[PDB]
Amino acid sequence: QNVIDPWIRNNFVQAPGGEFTVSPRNAPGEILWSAPLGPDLNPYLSHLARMYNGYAGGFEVQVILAGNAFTAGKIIFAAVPPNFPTEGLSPSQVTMFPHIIVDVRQLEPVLIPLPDVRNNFYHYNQSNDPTIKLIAMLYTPLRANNAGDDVFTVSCRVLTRPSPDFDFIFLVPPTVESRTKPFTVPILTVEEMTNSRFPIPLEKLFTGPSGAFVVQPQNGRCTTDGVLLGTTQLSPVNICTFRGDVTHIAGTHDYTMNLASQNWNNYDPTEEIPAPLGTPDFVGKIQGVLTQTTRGDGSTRGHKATVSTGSVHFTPKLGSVQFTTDTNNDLETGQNTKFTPVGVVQDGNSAHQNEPQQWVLPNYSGRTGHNVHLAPAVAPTFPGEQLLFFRSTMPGCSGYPNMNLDCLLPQEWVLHFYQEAAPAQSDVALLRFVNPDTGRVLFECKLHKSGYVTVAHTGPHDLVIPPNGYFRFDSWVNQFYTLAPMGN
Amino acid sequence: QNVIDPWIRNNFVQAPGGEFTVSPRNAPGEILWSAPLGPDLNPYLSHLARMYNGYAGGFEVQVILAGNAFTAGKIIFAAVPPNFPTEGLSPSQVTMFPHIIVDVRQLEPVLIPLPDVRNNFYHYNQSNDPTIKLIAMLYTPLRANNAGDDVFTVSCRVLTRPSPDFDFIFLVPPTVESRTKPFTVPILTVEEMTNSRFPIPLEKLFTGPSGAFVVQPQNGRCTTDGVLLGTTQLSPVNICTFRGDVTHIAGTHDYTMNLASQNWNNYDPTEEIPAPLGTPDFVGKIQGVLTQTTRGDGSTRGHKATVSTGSVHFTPKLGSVQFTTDTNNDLETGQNTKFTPVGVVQDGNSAHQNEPQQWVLPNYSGRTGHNVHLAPAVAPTFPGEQLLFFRSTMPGCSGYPNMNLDCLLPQEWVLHFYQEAAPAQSDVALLRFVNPDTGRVLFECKLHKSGYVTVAHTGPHDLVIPPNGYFRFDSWVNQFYTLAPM
Amino acid sequence: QNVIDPWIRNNFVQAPGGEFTVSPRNAPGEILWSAPLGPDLNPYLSHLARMYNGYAGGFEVQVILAGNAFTAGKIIFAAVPPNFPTEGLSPSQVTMFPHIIVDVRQLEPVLIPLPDVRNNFYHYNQSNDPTIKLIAMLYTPLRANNAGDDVFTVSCRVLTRPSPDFDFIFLVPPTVESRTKPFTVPILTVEEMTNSRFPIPLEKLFTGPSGAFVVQPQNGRCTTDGVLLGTTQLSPVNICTFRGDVTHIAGTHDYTMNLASQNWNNYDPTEEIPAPLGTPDFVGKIQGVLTQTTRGDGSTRGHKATVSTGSVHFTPKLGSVQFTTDTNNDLETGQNTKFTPVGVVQDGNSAHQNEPQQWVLPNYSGRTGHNVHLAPAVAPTFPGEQLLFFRSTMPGCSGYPNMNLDCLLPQEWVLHFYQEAAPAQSDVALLRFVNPDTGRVLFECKLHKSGYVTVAHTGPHDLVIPPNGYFRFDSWVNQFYTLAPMGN
Amino acid sequence: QNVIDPWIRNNFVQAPGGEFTVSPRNAPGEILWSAPLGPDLNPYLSHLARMYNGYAGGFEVQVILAGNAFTAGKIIFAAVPPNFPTEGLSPSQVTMFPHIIVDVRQLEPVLIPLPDVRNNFYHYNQSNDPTIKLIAMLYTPLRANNAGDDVFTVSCRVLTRPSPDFDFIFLVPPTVESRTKPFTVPILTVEEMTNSRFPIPLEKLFTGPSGAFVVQPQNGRCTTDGVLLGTTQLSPVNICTFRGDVTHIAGTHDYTMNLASQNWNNYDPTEEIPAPLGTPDFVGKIQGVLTQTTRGDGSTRGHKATVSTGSVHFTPKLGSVQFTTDTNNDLETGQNTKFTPVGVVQDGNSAHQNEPQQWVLPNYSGRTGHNVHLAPAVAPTFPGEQLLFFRSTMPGCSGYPNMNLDCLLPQEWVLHFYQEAAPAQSDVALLRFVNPDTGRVLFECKLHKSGYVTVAHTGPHDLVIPPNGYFRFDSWVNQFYTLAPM
């Protein structure tokens, strides 16, 4: 026995994840929108549910469309019982459920009740018990090609309010570990982020085709659930830093370095990670400073050094890496050393701007086997959109190296995702870039659960954005969302 | 006219910052506890007010003072008018107000009503209009008449419940830009957090005396409510790096560098910042690599270099610095150049492990002028309390440099504080280091809102830490809170 | 306890500042219209409020749109509580307030109540106490490109009426200093105005690009609040008149004149004004008549004289100016003199029509320092509009001087703004040019608070207007107003 | 309930400044009297309210007119709502307010209720909320015969008492909050106070016209509520001193001195003060003694030194002054140095009593720009009002300096105003000079909030006063009030 604010029961508010779009590309029978019946579909009820433990009641749902007077077609909303398969439901059969048919040209909203049916007294918030699922799908083919141009997108909005019999059961403190925390995105500006695959600051955003080359980086990969994938660290200082023992090679200036750990501990080759944490993810020659710190005397004399990834002597998985330097005598093998990255360089004997091939993965285990336990590849699926890369440039020292560098997620985003561990309600979350000076939205992008960002645009392009813009999270949408044109 | 859950109105719960302590170290007349009336006195109300815009009504507060039978003392509770300042209030002037005096040995809880005294219908949640304030003061010093070498610190609890006439007025969504986002600390363990004064991962914690030197670092300073001070900046990489234009000085290997802005622009000398963001704040010689990109052919040139922060020419504020290298050529004067530090070096002729001088601030304007806009100095304010430093080992390249480096706050903590502008309800936040696999508490530390951490210990001591330990926030306490010894 | 006319409570009238427009350029999340709850949003109530001191009640607001049947989208109106930030409000969150969603294709009006919430008994008219703010913003993206051409602008209109509980408190006389006087614009015709930067009558209006040169005049600058900026006087006779002592330079015809004041008082170089009041604002050679009036004998013999602004001998700030004349002996240094402007002349040794460069500001302090305390620069911000200049021509005497002259505001407008001192309710006021013969409006222009006029047009153009047209003030609008095309 | 003494509730007392006069020279429309409503109108209530927190209730005002049956003329009393400007009110408009018309022929007093109008339950003492005003204006001019050379002027007095609804709210300790602290002027005699612009004891008082020059002093400027203006300080021994480092100028007998703070710390030129505290604010030639605290051979130093306030090198704002001495080279750089003034001298190539022009401010910035953040200029505005200067004689070592130095406020007065930050209840305070030997009043003067004193006199005149006379504070009034001729 409990009561909520009387205003909530007498007004309609937008459901956090209740936005969807229809385009002529969508055919009848495809599922457009789906939502379980829970307190999370009403912002006030979602906020209150963090204070209580059990909901018990139905809803009233209101649908608003936005269509021009040229477009024609019908959209059917229906309620599906607690344990009923929804795969293969033809548009004819779905009418047998309680349903409403809404014309696209309908100015007014349409109402529908959602009475809760169950065999239990009440549900639990930290449980997955099936409930009535509200679905919305196309009824007749949509025809809007005549109107305007491009692909006329008709928008939808879903509002909800609680039924008079809705009530909560038990009162509990709102705790951090509740597993009900809403998903959020850091409000940091794009220019202050840190590149996840090299210690350099971000500068811009990029869009372009990805069909000409395979995208599968092992750095900057982290799902929205806070699970780290591939070979990703938290600290942006140990991105490409090696620490361990060093041995001189007589007759030349090359050195062989055996990696120990990030904490100067014994290396574990039995781990399922593809390569030791903090290894480079690109084929190229990297120039930096190697520093040896003798414990007794502090003989800290730095030396210029280079490492050429992708060569036959680069086997980080086995625990051996080759360094090329200028002095072959001024190093003592009895003390551990570390390597600090500085930049990349290009072999002048090859074509200009060719040495750094970010996409190509170097052979971590040399000639003894092919790399294993790699992060899954990333590629867009919905036609008409391209990946969004966070683009920066590393400094150069010699040759003409390729300045371009792209990372899927900034280091701050990875850190925040790891810290939050917020459960994902779907596979795709919708993010809008917002200018805080006026509040206008510049463009929309979809953040997939696998840890990448997609935006609807064709051809290479450099996004033009104000220096103070930031990303904001709005809702969870399914893969059928027709993303609005970017246009910047 | 909204309704609260009837369970809240009939039961007592503990306020977030609702515990204090009485210790023999406390002098008489000190403000032991202070709290303004409002939703913050009850966690349920402090969470429900996020959805509302106003409130009106009083409270009922119980105080639990279950002290030992061998102690003696008197504590006074008084109510302060809305507009009445309490900066220099004394016990007699406290007794002028409506007062209740209770023993430290009291067994029954002390019950106090707090009616809301106001000149309007209701208060605004987003505003800061003063209201009735409750203060608990140590009327009589605590003394113990027990045999044995023991200290009977008395821990006292405060519970609150809303009065029957408490109600909210208007309903608003719980957006970001509001009195929301209760304060929290990242759950990251010590190992992954990176240093704020230099790009080096942490390895240990330390506590020790600080009376022999002035502790006033400029990097890694941030108040707990999301304000950056001095030269603290978000990016863990741009911590001690420089970028700008380089010019060769004829007859010597030294180079004169004109500083650029953060990304590409020119530095503004009129900014209310002591130095360009990411300027080192310790006197010593820093070794690094100068990198230049030539637009003529795309070639990248990298050369070893050393910068003397203690030199006269080291004037980041004026926009001109001096670099020392070994090659006096192979550098163009019309291209942007970056400086990436690698480590710290020292002169072997000088005293070993005494040149870095981690607690000495180099002059940002050279001989002429002085440092102007600095962060406030940090020093403990309670007897028996020492600062807590996050210690890392900055690498060296020659000789025996003092590799021991200390930072007040890790870069992750300042990044989190800036990202989440959580308001502070008091001056001190209690943080307990806990072991998740065991459930015990290793030690208790106070996090001052100015951005530093204090503990109760005497003499130098290297902290012992489980690998999985992390900091957990518990309550809000004032400056006069006494900590349980390690 | 008081009563108002029963007709007001039973009818809707237009709110003085209640007009706004929506265009496809506007994106969701941007604030379109905002209005505090006060008596000033109802003309009858605004008139009555000048007679009373305290309002106390709510309103009923009605919204009318004007959209074709091709346009599609939604607009949301909401009420914001007395002390709630409105920055960053996403379109999803704003629905949590009391709200109404209006479709652009809605023929009928939509109603919404505005009940007043407050902690005081009643508000004060001469106070800034926060109240409920009504906001109106886009809900879904607007799509009208298919319909017609250009950028289809959909118009809006807001009507208001008082709630049954609205009542006034105290009765006071309507005084001039009330600080509640409505803003007004002089009804004088364009052809009888006086140029604010030279004593010549106005002749026409001009529009054109301003990106090729910097616009920052120091004359004719006066904000709508009656605060004088830069170096502006009230009397149009002392626009470029110098008065003070004169000293002959031996060996040539040049004279050095020390300015005293406009009232023949001691000069004050410690003033924060950039230059003495009434100095020229352009680089050029000015020809006029210098007259000396001896007190005892009235030796009033005029002499032709020229002054070359921008030269090294032109330092009005220090208090010294150089005059070039034809007679180097017929002047007595013991008597003060004045200079009367006549026209401008051009050096024939240079290119034709080049000497007068109105935009360029001469160095007021010669070589000793750069000019200080300048008026802020003026430049349009909303893309698609250009500044409106009041254009005239000065007479010429020698050479081929540039006849064109532009002033931002006429002298009569500056005088009226200084006299009225009417407070501004926003940063932009909307002015329509009206032909009084028939009452039709010719074009619309926006008068910014900084003291300049902007009109939507591209390319250089000379406006064609009837000789008897005059400007009229209608309302205050925000910077998001989409100005209608000028087209004349 | 918070009962007030019945004698207060059943008797009338005079308002602090509720007396005015109506003369035949007055024309219709002039505001004769104006006063806000509040506890201040009754001294008993104004002192009793210091122990309470809030008040609520109206007043009853009695008007007493001194006239006979051979005069004509009418006065109008009106009650202005709280937030309504009264400047520029036409004589016709005032009748639209609730008004009462009184004849100067009346003998009985006039009773006027004055209820409190507000939008909240009650007012706070520290809120300073606007309240209902009461204004008395001349409606119909005064027509009466004159007794020879004396013009017949009617007098009027105003008395107030609390309404039965007047009551206080909550009780607070009397002496912790300074917001309600009454204003008070020191009672030291004239011969004992100290001049503020130079460490010299005061000599006498001077009056005279000031329209021939700009009176803009920079020392001794302080508002009556305890706010310092310009470069005025507290210590009277640092009025014209310089502290800092010294460096000899080769080829001459001159020294460039770099200023330091009064604590021998660094001085920041960015401060929004016209000059470092203790900088002289008058053009002239100052002779003094220069003493340095030197190490090594000895600290015994000191020589006659001269400072040119009019020199182009005199840049106290930038931190550099020029000193002229008689020794070629005897000081060294790197030791703390102070300059002690002893007098003012003259140049033999200028007019007598022309160098120490006390009303001409030296250019604090030298020649690079103009002085900034100056103290507001002071000049009388009402007819027949002249400034009252505290005049002292300046000793001279050579030449014939203009020994007359004038100060608007002595150093003790500014020190007292800074110490006791008593808020001002109106725009001017009425001060009369009282001789305690006989109890008579020599003259009455107005003390403006800006920190200056005005008297009603015409032409130069040196005041003759008994040694024991001193100033006494009477009441706060507004500018409308007039003073009888001295």
Author numbering:
A (entry chain A), C (entry chain A): 45 to 532
B (entry chain B): 1045 to 1530
D (entry chain C): 2045 to 2530
Please share text taken word for word from the publication where this structure appeared.
The conformations of the A and B subunits are the same as in the X-ray structure, whereas the C subunit is ‘locked’ into a singular conformation selected from one of the 15 conformations observed in the crystal structure to adhere to the icosahedrally symmetric organization. In both the crystal and solution, the capsid protein VP1 assumes a resting state stabilized by an elaborate network of NTA linking the capsid subunits and the interactions between the S and P domains, as expected in a T = 3 icosahedral capsid. A novel finding is the metal ion binding at the dimeric interface of the P domain that further stabilizes the resting conformation. Although the metal ion observed in our crystal structure is likely Cd2+, based on the composition of the crystallization buffer, the nature of the metal ion in the cryo-EM density is uncertain.
Human noroviruses (HuNoVs) cause sporadic and epidemic viral gastroenteritis worldwide. All these structures showed that the capsid exhibits T = 3 icosahedral symmetry, with a diameter of ~400 Å, composed of 90 dimers of the capsid protein VP1 that consists of an internal N-terminal arm (NTA) and two distinct domains separated by a flexible hinge.
